Amino acid sequence: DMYIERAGDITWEKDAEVTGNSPRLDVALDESGDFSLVE
Amino acid sequence: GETTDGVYRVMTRRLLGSTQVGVGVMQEGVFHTMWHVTKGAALRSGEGRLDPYWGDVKQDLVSYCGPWKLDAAWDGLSEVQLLAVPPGERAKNIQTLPGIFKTKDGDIGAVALDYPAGTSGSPILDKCGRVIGLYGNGVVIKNGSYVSAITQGKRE
Numbered sequence: 005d006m007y008i009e010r011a012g013d014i015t016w017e018k019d020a021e022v023t024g025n026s027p028r029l030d031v032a033l034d035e036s037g038d039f040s041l042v043e
Numbered sequence: 044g045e046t047t048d049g050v051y052r053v054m055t056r057r058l059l060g061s062t063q064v065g066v067g068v069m070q071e072g073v074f075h076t077m078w079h080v081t082k083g084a085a086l087r088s089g090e091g092r093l094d095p096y097w098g099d100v101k102q103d104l105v106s107y108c109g110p111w112k113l114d115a116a117w118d119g120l121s122e123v124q125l126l127a128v129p130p131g132e133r134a135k136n137i138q139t140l141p142g143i144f145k146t147k148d149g150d151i152g153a154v155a156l157d158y159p160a161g162t163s164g165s166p167i168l169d170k171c172g173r174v175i176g177l178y179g180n181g182v183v184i185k186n187g188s189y190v191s192a193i194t195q196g197k198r199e
């Protein structure tokens with residue numbers, strides 16, 4: 005039995021930590037909603 | 044139950060103790076999450092029940108109480124924020140420049156940020172605070188790092 009609990013507002017925050025790269029990938033999406041890498 | 048707009052944890056008591064299985068967005072009286080988080084089950088909000096209204100396993104999305112309301116899209120140029128809600132931890136904004144998933148049916152933005160599975164459903168936002176998609180359906184690349192699609196529904 006699942007339940008929900010509030011965690012915060014949805015707002016852009018100035019001075020948020022900036023990280024993560026921006027890869028360009030060839031992918032395939034199957035009928036089950038799973039993504040896979042195409043090489 | 045609680046119908047205030049915002050980001051929410053999705054919890055279960057079926058496993059050991061109380062476990063966070065995902066995250067979602069309450070907007071315009073509709074709860075939005077990824078299909079793999081709830082599997083389409085009903086949800087509780089205090090003494091209230093939220094019933095599924097729309098869902099699609101291939102898009103990996105589900106809405107409760109009404110139709111999918113989130114229609115903003117990544118502009119393809121600008122940095123975005125993941126409003127990450129990890130299990131047991133405070134909501135935290137992370138700014139990043141998305142990468143791209145290229146498919147046979149078009150290109151989608153993607154966010155290369157590493158969080159536990161129970162963070163699925165956390166929203167990705169533009170500079171106006173609009174939700175451009177949900178984090179948590181993606182792939183593992185040639186180093187072990189996680190890359191999530193920016194998954195967005197269609198507002199009918």
Ligand SMILES: CN(C)C(=O)COc1cccc(F)c1
Pocket residue numbers: 156157158159160161162163178179180183187188189
């Ligand atoms: C090795 N790492 C960081 C991962 O692959 C984390 O996996 C995840 C992350 C978020 C949602 C999810 F559904 C799974």
